[PDB]
Write a sequence for this structure.
């Protein structure tokens, strides 16, 4: 059960981060603003600077007169706010935030959303899985956790906690990046962060799914407030599952990370005398079939809606579909349940 | 189903703050019926209650701003039979009664009691005389804005309260520190959202556990749960009054509910039985509502506060009165004149 222990580095580098100023994105990588960039390739120590670089390149620092030392401290607090499970760690939040930046650069989001909405989307991406324990919402309820005691009646247990952790960082002395905003705009930011983070609960996505389809059918209306809110939910889910839009090496490695995390939850449930979900049981789970189901029923419909709303997003949908075909190829040359004994899918 | 908004002061500035005994010698008693106060005297009574609980002095509230805030809240209610200003006023009066009769200061922080009172005033702002299910069914702008997150009307009531605070010269918390201003908004959000019966149903077991284990003032969750319980006890406080009050409030509630059912039928949808004047049997519905909803809230209050026993006994007595009078109420819906005086 030791593989279920995921530590926090601190409790709920700064001058060093701003010593040479904020780096222009092209200096980080000429491919930084491309859908072919793999943000998980960036060294972890360079991710805080890349966050500042993206906020600078999207002109949020200048447009909102964000204090750079406060932003640097906020970025470091958010990074330190993640534990170290195989998948739900800072590198996942960083990669999700990078995808938000890619949508801004490639889909020209400023023609669909308000500046404040795009800013909130990016901050929400950074914060959206804060303090994740490597377990799902059902586990919180089963383990009778403090998080389930605080939030289980309302659903979205972990997501309500991620939002609460994001707010606690803003409330930390020297970390409130938007404390200069008007009362109306500060409230708008908090409401946006709450809605966007809560949109990462798959149960929420499934409830609003028919409304997202209706919006894609009738066409996006930039004057429709509900369309802005539905679009932010869609974009957030697309950032959260963006590893599926990268190359085969990325989808293969992320299956390794997802199933190492899920199987550790399954082992922990068995230790507690409970029968875990099939996808979390290393003795029952058949990864290629589970991956094909996730891709066909959860990921591909999100990128299909994205393509329906933004023709320039067609390449993302095509890549997700291509990765699904690669998993179908794998299913005719993968004869094991769970992960291999060495916990590696490198042989694929 | 048409209920209007009156819009989009000197009398209050001159004599808005009165000693509560001058309003009525029984003003601070559980046997006072706040609906007996003339509507034109309610804003003065709100200021008088805030003065009597010493919030005006303790929080350095600007009295002209407070008078403007009270007037804005009063104009913020429409005129359906039940969900109007007199309901908000009577709910606010009950909060004042809990402060005066129970030892609230021994359970909650002054800021939380203050937020409870202001939330009582605002908790049904701009109510349309329809429930949350109706907002979704009618595909309203409120449902478009809030249905995906839950508690459509309650999120709207809180948004309306915030809009009043943001109105020129009505911000009663203007001088508060940034941290305290935010605490007030968070408390108002949590307390107003606690008025959705769906929320109460979801947290009942946790309220049932806090009372079983015993109230812990050092437990932040116990403060949150207690505020939810207190807010629902204020919302249903008409049930703690005399039989005449319970009977009149049934006339108001069902005239409003039946108007929603008539509207649903006009839209080609079948309303729930309780909103259908052709199906609803008021005594049976009220006995069920008192057994499942009202009585357990006051029983929890009695378990946490011994002085609250009379509240539960009155609710139980009113439920027994519905059973005894059911033999004389031989019809579904309401009589042609919408009155229950015949009982
Ligand atoms: C954590 C989960 C997940 C998060 C978030 C949402 C949404 F859409 F609701 F935001 C859905 C699902 N998740 N993330 C991945 C990474 O590709 C995978 C995966 O490969 N297989 C899964 O069974 N679940 C996965
Ligand atoms: C509006 C509704 C109601 C509001 C609020 C809450 C709570 F508890 F959640 F706050 C519960 C229920 N309500 N109010 C009354 C008046 O005493 C009655 C009634 O007598 N019969 C009903 O069926 N519903 C009634
Ligand atoms: Mg998450
Ligand atoms: Mg209400
Ligand atoms: Zn995530
Ligand atoms: Zn009410």
């Amino acid at each position: 059960l030791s593989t279920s222990l995921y530590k926090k580095a601190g409790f709920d580098e700064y001058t060093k981060l701003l010593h040479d100023g904020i780096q222009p994105v092209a200096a980080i990588d000429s491919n930084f603003a491309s859908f072919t960039y793999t943000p998980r390739s960036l060294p972890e120590d360079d991710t805080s600077m890349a966050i500042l670089s993206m906020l600078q390149d999207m002109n949020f620092i200048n447009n909102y007169k964000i204090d750079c030392p406060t932003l640097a401290r906020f970025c470091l607090m958010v990074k330190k706010g993640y534990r170290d499970p195989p998948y739900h760690n800072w590198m996942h939040a960083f990669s999700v935030s990078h995808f938000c930046y890619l949508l801004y650069k490639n889909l020209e989001l400023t023609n669909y959303l308000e500046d404040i909405e795009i800013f909130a989307l990016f901050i929400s991406c950074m914060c959206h899985d804060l303090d994740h324990r490597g377990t799902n919402n059902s586990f919180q309820v089963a383990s009778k956790s403090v998080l389930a005691a605080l939030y289980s009646s309302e659903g979205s247990v972990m997501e309500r906690h991620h939002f609460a952790q994001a707010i606690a960082i803003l409330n930390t002395h020297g970390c409130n990046i938007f404390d200069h905003f008007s009362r109306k705009d500060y409230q708008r930011m908090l409401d946006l962060m709450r809605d966007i983070i809560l949109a990462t609960d798959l149960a929420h996505h499934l409830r609003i799914f028919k409304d997202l389809q209706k919006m894609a059918e009738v066409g996006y209306d930039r004057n429709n407030k509900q369309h802005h809110r539905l679009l932010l939910c869609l974009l957030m889910t697309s950032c959260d599952l963006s590893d599926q839009t990268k190359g085969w090496k990325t989808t293969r490695k992320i299956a390794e990370l997802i199933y190492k995390e899920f199987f550790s939850q399954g082992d922990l449930e068995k230790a507690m005398g409970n029968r875990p979900m099939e996808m979390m049981d290393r003795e029952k789970a058949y990864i290629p079939e589970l991956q094909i189901s996730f891709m066909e029923h959860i990921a591909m419909p999100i990128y299909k809606l994205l393509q329906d709303l933004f023709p320039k997003a067609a390449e993302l949908y095509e890549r997700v579909a291509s990765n699904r075909e690669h998993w179908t190829k794998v299913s005719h040359k993968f004869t094991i349940r769970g992960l291999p004994s060495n916990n590696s899918l490198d042989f694929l």
